[PDB]
């Protein structure tokens, strides 16, 4: 039925401890400090609510998935690893492989992706409008961000995954494996502690487009489809 | 004619195309079906990246050929 590498991913999830699987007080969310550039794994773990995947399990699954996807022409792809990051399409598939497992039983887990780019002849996105979320209580964003401070430092745009979760009171929380905002200057001093910030995802996105240069954004989550993101008011 | 476009989501997109369609037109058909903006689409055929200004015939892409689609995003 299932490929051996996909089954291995499902097996690891089934053995994971997920104390933040459901809505919990914000202090109980599972948020991992960043390791290398594994923010996709950290965001997946915050999304599901526990250390569901470790870096070795996820990287092994991703490599085998690359082999099945394109086989011996894999040398045509840019590297994807804990050291260089992962495509939003891989995060979608990993999460959809968990639909129907005993941990996700009774939960909306039809995961899809929506991707927004600048208008023609525009350098950045001027506005991101989220779809109506209904009762959705978990999301992952992949954002590509530049800024005046980054240009002044000669730094590349940051391409970064974060997670959002609703707590037991219904308030949204940004769960970020980095210790500073995506739009912060690259030389900013920090404590290393992951970001746990009470903010609506729409307000967080508006904060990026107001403070920095949003080049691209991917929204991943239950009930999300290709047309979910728009760039006009609602 | 039909061609297939695999993605790392594991879903394969089926497109109705003609040999004279440009890669730009093909990315427009992918956007209409899946919503992926064309500037985020990187299309590959047999290990070769496809240029927007060329056509399917220039790459000898025929009916039921399989293309590979990857995003430029890599968080």
Q: How far apart are CA A21 and CA A104, in angstroms?
A: 9
SS (H, E, C) chain A: CCCHHHHHHHHHHHCCCCCCCCCCCHHHCCCCCCCCCCHHHHHHHHHHCCCCCCHHHHHHHHHHHHHHHHHHHHHHCCCCECCCECCHHHHHHHHHCCCCCCCCCCCCCCEEEEEECCCCCCCCCCCCECCCCCCCCEEEEEEEEECHHHHHHCCCCEEEEEEEEECCCCCEEEEECCCCCCCCCCCCCCCCCCEEEECCHHHHHHHHHHHCEEEEEEEEEECCCCCCCECCCC
3-state SS, residue B34? helix
User: Residue A150: left if φ>0, alpha if ψ -120 to 50, beta else—which one?
Assistant: alpha
Burial B42-55 (b: 16+ CB within 10 A, else e): bbbbeeeebeeeeb
Q: Which of A115, A161, A227 lies nearest to residue B40, judging by beta carbons?
A: A115
Q: How far apart are CA A211 and CA A169, in angstroms?
A: 29
Q: How far apart are CA B31 and CA A160, in angstroms?
A: 23
Query: Tokens 């290393």 sit at which residue?
Result: A192
Please name each of the domains of chain A with its CATH number. 4-222 (3.90.70)
- The CATH number assigned to the domain holding B21 equals 3.10.20.90
- Per the CB < 8 A criterion, the answer to whether A31 and A175 are in contact is yes
Q: Quick one: CA dihedral A104, B73, A183, A39, positive or negative?
A: positive
**Contact call for A87 and B49, based on CB within 8 A:** no
3-state SS, residue B16? strand
- Per the CB < 8 A criterion, the answer to whether A32 and A179 are in contact is no
Q: How far apart are CA B47 and CA A69, in angstroms?
A: 12
Query: Tokens 């530049």 sit at which residue?
Result: A146
Q: How far apart are CA A144 and CA A139, in angstroms?
A: 17
**Contact call for A69 and B68, based on CB within 8 A:** yes
- Per the CB < 8 A criterion, the answer to whether A128 and A228 are in contact is no
Residue range of the domain that includes B32: 1-75
- Per the CB < 8 A criterion, the answer to whether A175 and A196 are in contact is yes
- Total residue count of chain A as it appears in this document: 234
Q: Which residues, including other chains, have CB under 8 Å from residue B55's CB and lie 6 or more apart?
A: B19, B20, B21, B22, B23
Helix (H) or strand (E) holding B8: none
How close is the nearest chain A Cα to the Cα of B31, in Å? 9
**Token pair of A90 as six digits:** 């891989």
DSSP state of B50: P
**Nearest 5 degrees, angle CA B56-CA A218-CA B53?**
20
- Count of domains in chain B? 1
Q: How far apart are CA A6 and CA A3, in angstroms?
A: 5
φ and ψ of A199, to 5 deg? -160, 140
- Per the CB < 8 A criterion, the answer to whether A64 and A5 are in contact is yes
Q: Does A93 touch chain B (CB under 8 A)?
A: yes
φ and ψ of A4, to 5 deg? -55, -40
Mutation target for B interface from A90, A111, A144: give the one with most B CBs within 10 A.
A90
**Token pair of A57 as six digits:** 């399990």
Q: How far apart are CA A13 and CA A198, in angstroms?
A: 27
Comparing alpha-carbon positions, the chain A residue that sits nearest to B50 is A76
């Amino acid at each position: 039925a299932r490929s051996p590498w996909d089954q291995a991913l499902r097996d690891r999830f089934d053995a994971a401890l997920l104390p933040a699987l459901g809505p919990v007080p914000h202090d109980q969310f599972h948020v991992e400090p960043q390791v290398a550039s594994a923010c996709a794994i950290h965001s997946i773990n915050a999304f599901v609510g526990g250390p569901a995947f470790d870096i070795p399990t996820f990287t092994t699954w991703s490599t085998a998935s690359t082999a099945a996807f394109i086989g011996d022409d894999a040398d045509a792809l840019a590297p994807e690893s804990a050291a260089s990051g992962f495509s939003p399409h891989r995060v979608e598939r990993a999460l959809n492989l968990l639909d129907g497992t005993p941990a996700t039983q009774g939960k909306d887990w039809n995961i899809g992706v929506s991707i927004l780019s600048p208008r023609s002849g525009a350098a950045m996105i001027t506005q991101v409008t989220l779809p109506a979320l209904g009762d959705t209580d978990r999301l992952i964003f992949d954002v590509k961000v530049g800024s005046d401070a980054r240009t002044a430092a000669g730094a590349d745009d940051i391409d970064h995954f974060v997670a959002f979760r609703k707590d037991d009171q219904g308030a949204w929380w940004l769960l970020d494996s980095r210790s500073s905002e995506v739009h912060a200057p690259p030389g900013q001093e920090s404590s290393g502690s992951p970001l746990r910030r009470q903010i609506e995802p729409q307000a967080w996105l508006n904060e990026i487009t107001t403070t920095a240069h949003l080049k691209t954004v991917a929204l991943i989550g239950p009930g999300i489809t290709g047309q979910s993101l728009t760039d006009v008011p609602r | 004619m039909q061609i297939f476009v695999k993605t790392l989501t594991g879903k394969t997109i089926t497109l109705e195309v003609e040999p004279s369609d440009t890669i730009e037109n093909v990315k427009a058909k992918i956007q209409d079906k899946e919503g992926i903006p064309p500037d985020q689409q990187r299309l590959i055929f047999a290990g070769k990246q496809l240029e927007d200004g060329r056509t399917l015939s220039d790459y000898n892409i025929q009916k039921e050929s399989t293309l590979h689609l990857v995003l430029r995003l890599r968080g």
